[PDB]
Design a protein around this ligand. Structure first.
Ligand SMILES: *C/C=C1/C(=C/c2[nH]c(/C=C3[NH+]=C(/C=C4\NC(=O)C(C=C)=C4C)C(C)=C\3CCC(=O)O)c(CCC(=O)O)c2C)NC(=O)[C@H]1C
Length: 301
C-alpha cells in the first residue's frame, strides 16, 4: 500500500496495522554519530543542516546554513563538482581527529555525511571458493564477524511468503543460537525490502539514541521531503528501533543479498551495546555484500 506522508507533513504514526506504509526513506532526521548537510547541486549553497552539526564541524547550524561549499570545503568542492555514485574524502582539520565525508546526489541536491574516522583478498577468496550454498552462508557470516567484531552475524533468507529464516550464524562465545529461527514477513515490511533492493546497507549505531532533525526539515528547493534512502546516517524507523531494543540489541547493521534484482536475504549484524562500525569497514562490507550476492546468484544457477 502507498506511503503515508511523513510525520512532519501530518501523516499517521505507524502501527502494526500499517507497517508497510511508513515512508522510512524521508524521516527528516539523522542518527547522532555523524552530521548531515544538504546543498544545492549547482551553487553549493548549504540548504539543510542537522541540528548537531557543530559537534562534528565546529560551527552552529545557523552559521553553516546559507554558506557555500566553496567557502566551507574549498578543496573538496571542485572535486565534488567534478565527481558528482558516492564521493568520499578524509578531512584532517578537526581537533577531534579526522572526519570521513561521503557525498551523493539526488536530483538537484547534494547530501553530505560527516562522521569520525590482504584481509580483502582473503575474504573475497573465501566467498568465491565456497562450493555449495551452505558453505557460502557459513563463510559469509564468519568472515563478516571476523572483520567487524559484531557480537552476532546471521544470514536471513526470505521465503516466497516473505517470511524469513536465519540459515547461518557466527556469534560470540556462549551466546544463544538464533540459527533456524523463523520470523513473520511484517518484521521486514515490503517497503523496507524494496528500499533494500536499491540502497544496500543500513544501520542503527545506538538503538536508544534520539534522532537529530534536519533544519529546515523540508528541502527548500522543492518544499518537499529530503530523500535520505542513500544516507547511512538516516534515522531508523521507530518501530524497528523498538524491535531492536526489545531484543537487547544496541547496534544493528544489515547488508542486502540481491539476486535477479530481488531481495534474496540480508546479512544481519547485532551488537549488544551501541557500536559505530568504522567507515572503512562499511565500504568493505558493501563489497562483500556484492560478492555474496554474485555467489548466491552463481550457485543457484
Ligand atoms: C509494524 C512495523 C514493524 C517493523 C518494521 C520495520 N523493520 C525494519 C527493518 C528490519 N527488520 C529486520 C528484521 C530482523 N532483524 C533481526 O535480528 C531478526 C530476527 C532475529 C529479524 C526478523 C532487519 C534485519 C531490518 C533491517 C535493518 C537492520 O538491519 O537493522 C524496518 C525498516 C528500518 C529502516 O531501515 O529504517 C521497518 C519499518 N518490524 C516489526 O517487527 C514490526 C513491528
Amino acid at each position: 500500500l502507498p506511503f503515508f506522508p511523513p510525520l512532519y507533513l501530518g501523516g499517521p504514526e505507524i502501527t502494526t496495522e500499517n507497517c508497510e506504509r511508513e515512508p522510512i526513506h524521508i524521516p527528516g532526521s539523522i542518527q547522532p554519530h555523524g552530521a548531515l548537510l544538504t546543498a544545492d547541486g549547482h551553487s553549493g549553497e548549504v540548504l539543510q543542516v542537522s541540528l548537531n552539526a557543530a559537534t562534528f564541524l565546529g560551527q552552529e547550524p545557523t552559521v553553516l546554513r546559507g554558506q557555500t561549499l566553496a567557502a566551507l570545503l574549498p578543496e573538496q568542492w571542485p572535486a565534488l563538482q567534478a565527481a558528482l555514485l558516492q564521493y568520499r574524502a578524509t578531512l584532517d582539520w578537526p581537533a577531534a581527529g579526522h572526519l570521513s565525508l561521503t557525498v551523493h546526489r539526488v536530483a538537484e541536491l547534494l547530501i553530505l555525511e560527516f562522521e569520525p574516522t590482504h584481509a580483502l583478498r582473503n575474504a573475497m577468496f573465501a566467498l568465491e571458493s565456497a562450493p555449495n550454498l551452505r558453505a557460502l552462508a557459513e563463510v559469509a557470516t564468519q568472515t563478516v564477524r571476523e572483520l567487524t567484531g559484531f557480537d552476532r552475524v546471521m544470514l536471513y533468507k526470505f521465503a516466497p511468503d516473505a517470511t524469513g529464516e536465519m540459515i547461518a550464524e557466527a556469534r560470540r562465545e556462549g551466546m544463544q543460537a538464533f540459527l533456524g529461527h523463523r520470523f513473520p514477513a511484517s518484521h521486514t515490511p515490503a517497503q523496507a525490502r524494496a528500499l533494500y533492493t536499491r540502497h544496500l546497507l543500513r544501520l542503527t549505531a545506538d538503538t536508544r539514541a534520539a534522532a537529530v532533525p534536519l533544519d529546515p526539515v523540508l528541502n527548500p528547493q522543492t518544499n518537499a521531503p529530503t530523500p535520505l534512502g542513500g544516507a547511512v546516517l538516516r534515522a531508523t524507523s521507530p518501530m524497528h528501533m523498538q524491535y531492536l531494543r526489545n531484543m537487547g540489541v544496541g547496534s544493528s547493521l544489515s547488508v542486502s543479498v540481491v539476486v535477479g534484482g530481488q531481495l534474496w536475504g540480508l546479512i544481519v549484524c547485532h551488537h549488544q551495546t551501541p557500536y559505530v562500525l568504522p567507515p572503512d569497514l562499511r565500504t568493505t562490507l558493501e563489497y562483500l555484500g556484492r560478492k555474496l550476492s554474485g555467489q548466491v546468484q552463481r550457485k543457484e544457477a
